[PDB]
């Protein structure tokens, strides 16, 4: 079976044909027990002293709205100017959504800049089952997006879903599952998050949020000894 040779015949992407897309139930419930209240702050990130967020963050999910996502936007020019290094913790992770164009390169440049080294490349692989069937530079129809994982200081790498209805910009939630299952820290920040992505255990910050509950002193209060260090997968301590 050649599923590339097939796609060419029909328009059923090879990924269309991947069959199956001791339970980890405690880990989920321990995430849930540890999770902060959801928080969120409507903020024009460009126009926004970034240092006005604290404490530093154990994990960061960067989902900036790419020019390409559409067939205010951020260019890699704009994204690369962010001072992420300044709100990451000494031991910190980052998950940067990169698209499928220049971002696969410029995002690595971003990671190095903010002092990360990429240890994982996670692929969102989109199916066109409901729709059997490109920028000029490209050679092949592009049928996936990349999330790059970066570490600072000392579940598989795939996500299979249907291609979203074109112009719908959302990323598979599975991403949160993968982050949360790593047990990295309870200080979690989603940049360029939306009302739709707001989630317990996360501080969502972005321009399109319609309401704000954020308060630094209050947020900080959630990680005061003896809670500061916790994994997110641990119990709390009475």
């Amino acid at each position: 079976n050649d599923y590339c040779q097939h796609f060419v015949d029909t328009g059923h992407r090879p990924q269309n044909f991947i069959r199956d897309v001791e339970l980890i139930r405690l880990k989920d419930e321990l995430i849930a027990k540890s999770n902060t209240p959801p928080m969120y702050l409507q903020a024009d990130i460009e126009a926004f002293d970034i240092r006005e967020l604290t404490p530093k963050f154990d994990v960061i999910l960067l989902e900036p709205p790419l020019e390409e996502y559409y067939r205010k936007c951020w260019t890699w020019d704009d994204i690369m100017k962010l001072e992420i290094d300044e709100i990451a913790a000494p031991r910190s992770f980052i998950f940067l959504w990169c698209g499928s164009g220049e971002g696969l390169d410029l995002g690595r440049v971003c990671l190095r800049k903010w002092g990360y080294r990429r240890c994982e490349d996670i692929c969102w692989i989109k199916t066109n089952k409901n729709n059997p069937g490109l920028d000029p530079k490209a050679v092949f129809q592009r049928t996936k997006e990349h999330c790059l994982m970066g570490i600072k200081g000392t579940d598989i790498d795939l996500i299979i879903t249907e291609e979203p209805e074109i112009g719908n910009i959302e990323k598979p939630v599975e991403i949160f599952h993968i982050i949360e299952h790593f047990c990295l820290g309870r200080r979690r920040l989603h940049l360029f998050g939306r009302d739709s992505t707001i989630r317990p255990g996360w501080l969502t910050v972005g321009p399109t949020l319609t309401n704000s509950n954020y308060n630094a002193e209050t947020y900080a209060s959630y990680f005061s000894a003896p809670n500061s260090y916790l994994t997110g997968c641990t119990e709390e301590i009475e």
Binding site: P14, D105, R108, L134, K137, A138, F140, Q141, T143, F182
Partner: protein, 200 residues
Amino acid sequence: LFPPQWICCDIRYLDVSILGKFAVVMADPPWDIHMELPYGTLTDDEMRRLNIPVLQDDGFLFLWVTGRAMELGRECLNLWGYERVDEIIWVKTNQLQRIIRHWLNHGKEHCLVGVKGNPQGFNQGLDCDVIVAEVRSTSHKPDEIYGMIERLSPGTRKIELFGRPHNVQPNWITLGNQLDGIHLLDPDVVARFKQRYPDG
């Protein structure tokens, strides 16, 4: 179509110029992923200094990567004077089309796609950038990529670096130190070889 040709050799010492120009270069190089690996590697410098730029005036590079070789291949690929325009992922399925097994299990392999100059004739956009295929072999790519590439540049001259014996395909000269001797047929290369290597 042209029967498989190949040349067992150290791809560090060979005069690749004799071979001329190809629309497509592919390499599955043995990167120095410092695992103390079970086969011979090249250092970074060895790879950087590889004499790629001579092989193409215009056309495409297919470079397989892994671990840190995702950063170095990009380096190599820029140093060689390519821009990366595509990144093909291979998804490894069992005989039952289920996925197979660095903080995560790797279910996929990456092949960066570089362009050099202004290439024309190419059926760009024919395949898509995902390959779904069984892990039939040990440390090898799938036959599907020779399919995708011929559809891309049908009937053109193509060369492969660090290709092992089963990678040998029509239209493809394969270079590598694990090939059974030399097998050459394009007289214009025979000519150029004999005189450059008067006794091999």
